[PDB]
Design a protein around this nucleic acid. Structure first.
Lengths: 180, 97
DNA sequence: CTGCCGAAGCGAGCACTACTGTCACACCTATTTTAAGCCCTTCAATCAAATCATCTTTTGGTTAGGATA
DNA sequence: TATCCTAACCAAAAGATGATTTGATTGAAGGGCTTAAAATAGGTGTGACGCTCGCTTCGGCAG
């Protein structure tokens, strides 16, 4: 009920946050949700892609220094959120989001945006090595989305000679997205 | 605990892969028992009845001809003999490996 | 030897605990075909970092290339 | 001689360089399951329900 209520007012929320409390299980509450919605025939919006990023990105601990994240890890929220918006706009039109869980897409986009804002200090990091410093947990499909997007950017790069001349690959392309 | 409680479908747990000699023994049981997946599950205590049904479904995709060939290769049925054969052949597989 | 009637005392309306049982139906048994995703080992195949074998520049230092004292 | 400077170069210091194995990364599958449907059979176990006139108490004599 609260899920549908928040959806009517497009208030951001996700299933896991709710189900952590109710002793719930995916089958149980998903089936109950389908039953209630099809019983009452109520209309309800979907999770807008940009709706959830605003609160999700603000949850990171990258915006101020800490022993887990020295300055070389600290970053400004505005730049990375703009980069992630510029990445998700690529994701959907490339069919990447349809039929998939979105939060893996957001996780991969944020990880790579943070890396490429200071890659010299950040190309040495890793998905888990990142997420643990900000007290974040990551999807396994995050790697799948990362491979997909890396393929997409390597496909993108060959269209420009002054990017093609560098013979970009997985190792190097991360620092060039600012130009792409 | 953190708000980023990732959720994904976990019903696809890691089950032990099926052995080749175990598959041969499954076909032998098809020949000598039939398609009674409950009694097969008793014969294969390592495998529950739902695993037996899954094995049937996977094998029938291409090896349905072998299912029929085994089913027509009928044999007298003995639980004790089947158990001894299973354990002995698995031990011999371990020794060969 | 009863009791009248005094003296001391307090009071308030105005202050521009539940079952509990029946009972009915949620709950199951049985499955079959998509079609995407998500899921952990597990094997098979390949990629990546530290070490080993090897080349080079200086300090110690000679012969030899050179010099003073 | 006894010694230093110092081309070339031994020897090691030290500075560093190409290839290999081993630690690590990886694709895809092993394998497992869901919604969308058709359904009828048998059941058992949960859980609906600031005074100041009025009014009260009790001793000390009259008759």
């Amino acid at each position: 009920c609260v899920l549908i209520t928040c959806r009517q007012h497009n208030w951001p929320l996700t299933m896991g946050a709710i189900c952590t409390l109710l002793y719930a299980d995916l089958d149980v509450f998903s089936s109950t949700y389908m039953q209630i919605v099809k019983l009452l025939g109520l209309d309800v919006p979907s999770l807008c892609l940009a709706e959830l990023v605003k609160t999700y990105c603000s949850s990171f601990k990258l915006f101020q220094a800490s022993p887990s994240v020295p300055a070389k890890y600290v970053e400004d929220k505005e730049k990375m959120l703009s980069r992630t918006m510029q990445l998700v706009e690529l994701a959907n039109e490339t069919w990447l989001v349809t039929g998939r869980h979105p939060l893996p897409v957001i996780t991969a986009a944020t990880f790579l945006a943070w890396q490429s804002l200071q890659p010299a200090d950040r190309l040495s990091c890793s998905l888990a090595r990142f997420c643990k410093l900000a007290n974040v947990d990551l999807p396994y499909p995050a790697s799948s989305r990362l491979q997909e997007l890396l393929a997409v950017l390597l496909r993108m790069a060959e269209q420009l000679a002054w990017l093609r001349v560098l013979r970009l690959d997985k190792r190097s392309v991360v620092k060039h997205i600012g130009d792409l | 605990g953190s708000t980023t409680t990732y959720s994904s479908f976990r019903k696809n747990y890691y089950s032990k892969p099926w052995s080749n000699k175990e598959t041969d023994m499954f076909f032998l049981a098809i020949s000598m028992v039939g398609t009674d997946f409950s009694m097969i599950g008793q014969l294969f205590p390592h495998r529950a009845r739902i695993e037996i049904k899954n094995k049937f479904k996977r094998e029938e995709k291409t090896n349905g001809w072998r299912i029929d060939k085994a089913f027509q290769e009928k044999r007298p049925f003995d639980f004790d003999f089947f158990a001894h054969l299973l354990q002995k052949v698995l031990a011999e597989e371990e020794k060969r490996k």
